[PDB]
Amino acid sequence: AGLMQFANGTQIPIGTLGAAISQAKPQKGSTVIINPDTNGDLSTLAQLLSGFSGTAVGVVKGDWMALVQAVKNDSSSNVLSTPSITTLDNQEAFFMVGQDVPVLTGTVERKKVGIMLKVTPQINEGNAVQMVIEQEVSKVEGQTSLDVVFGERKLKTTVLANDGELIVLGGLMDDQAGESVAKVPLLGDIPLIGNLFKSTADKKEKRNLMVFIRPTILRDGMAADGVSQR
Amino acid sequence: KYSKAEDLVDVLKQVSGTLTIVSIAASKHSNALIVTAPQDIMQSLQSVIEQLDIRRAQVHVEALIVEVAEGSNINFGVQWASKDAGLMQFANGTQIPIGTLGAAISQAKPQKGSTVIINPDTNGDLSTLAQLLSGFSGTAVGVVKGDWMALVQAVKNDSSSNVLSTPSITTLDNQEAFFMVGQDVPVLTGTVERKKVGIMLKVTPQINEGNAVQ
Amino acid sequence: VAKVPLLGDIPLIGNLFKSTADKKEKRNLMVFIRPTILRDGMAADGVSQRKYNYMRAEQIYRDEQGLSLMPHTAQPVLPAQNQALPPEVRAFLNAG
């Protein structure tokens, strides 16, 4: 007499569940021309539940069932990293903290990923530093068919910063709000009992990068020992 | 004071070339150029360098990438089936057809076995029936009695999206900046070349003195 | 649409014989760009100081509601601007 099934999520569908339950029943064996029971094979049922997360409440009685699934995933992150290098004026410095990973490529060339900062200052005598800068922050994130993909975010610009003060190089601000729904249609609109017939998925996401840079000028022999001593 | 000594060094080699002996050399480490010329050419090349040494303005370029998507669809239709006396079947959707259903139900019946020259029941194999239902979404209401059936399927999918991303970079005037936030992914290609995907902004401003950035 | 044909046109019981699928879709992109000119040495610190105090107010509000399992435990916040003098450094002036 029917089913109702929704493919949103992450929300495991009740059709392909109700099969995996029945393929899990013990099959009563006999062999003639014994009374073992092969029991089940849960390979199928445990594959649904492999990545599943969050509630599934049910009524399974007489093969008819009502399965109410709900979850709320909520994450956060905070990161602050601050590489720094010391050069003479007009000379370029390179600073990498990372790892050196092979790329396929062709023949296996050898590629470097990680925090990288390459800067070449010149003091402009207004006491203002004038960088030529390449920031980069990479990491190995998972694979692809034929190789590794690298998460990578880099910016190479030229900025002009005062001696002791902080200029912003770059940035990103990224928002999203998804939504989805599914319903019967006509019954999903009742203001009370509508929710029995719907399957909703919402999403919200946010990210902020910033990259700042602060030069400092060490002129005296005593100025180099003020920063490097603290 | 401002210019990079070895940028002016070529600009000054032409100016000095046709102003004629004259030599221009630039010390990289000290950021200073060394002009050797007669007393007349010198006083010219001092008023040029004085006017090419000016202070540069820097620009902050924000982009705003907005996207607002809104989907919908609705799917509603009735299907019949029966004994030898007919069927009605529609291939729209996403709307799983009643013919290929009524088979997958019957291939799912338990086949009563016996073996002689036992009384197990092999039960079913639902591989076929659970393949229909794999991607199916939305109502299917039915009457399955006496192999004739009427299967009323309906759904309404409705999505939405909203996105706002705003990369920004800071450059000096006339210098080009590059800003990528993304990932670096291999493309086949041939030999596996290495390609960069993600938000990318590459801009090279110049201030037009009407206070307008170009 | 699909239908029988002749029976799908009855104004009431037509719907028993039909199968309909509708679709509607919409999308909008825009890309805008806003330049800004930083001329003074003080102009570079007007823009880059307000984006700093904007990120530092994200990391404080992220901090005010802490890591829930481990309190109180720190969490990175971005140094203040114009910290002035620490309280104990303050007193050293008032003596010497």
Partner: protein, 84 residues
């Protein structure tokens, strides 16, 4: 999970930490005690009482992390909520 606890010895380091980034001499956060390195006697009564008057020191010396001072000749003393 579940409740103080509190406070330092972290922040008792973090507070000597804060002192030294501007410096000048050092401050050492030893256990819960703060230390400071370099005829300043009447320095003390002056110098101490501003701390004793500071509401964070009036918080912290009343929080229970110790304070101390050192001076170079050489000498020192410790001061807590009681000595204030």
């Amino acid at each position: 999970c579940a409740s103080h606890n509190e406070n330092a010895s972290l922040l008792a380091k973090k507070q000597a930490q804060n002192i030294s980034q501007n410096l000048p001499v050092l401050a050492q956060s030893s256990g819960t005690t703060v230390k400071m390195t370099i005829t300043p006697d009447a320095f003390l009564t002056s110098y101490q009482r501003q701390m004793c008057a500071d509401p964070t020191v009036k918080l912290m010396l009343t929080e229970g992390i110790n304070y101390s001072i050192t001076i170079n000749n050489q000498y020192q003393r410790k001061l807590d909520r009681t000595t204030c």
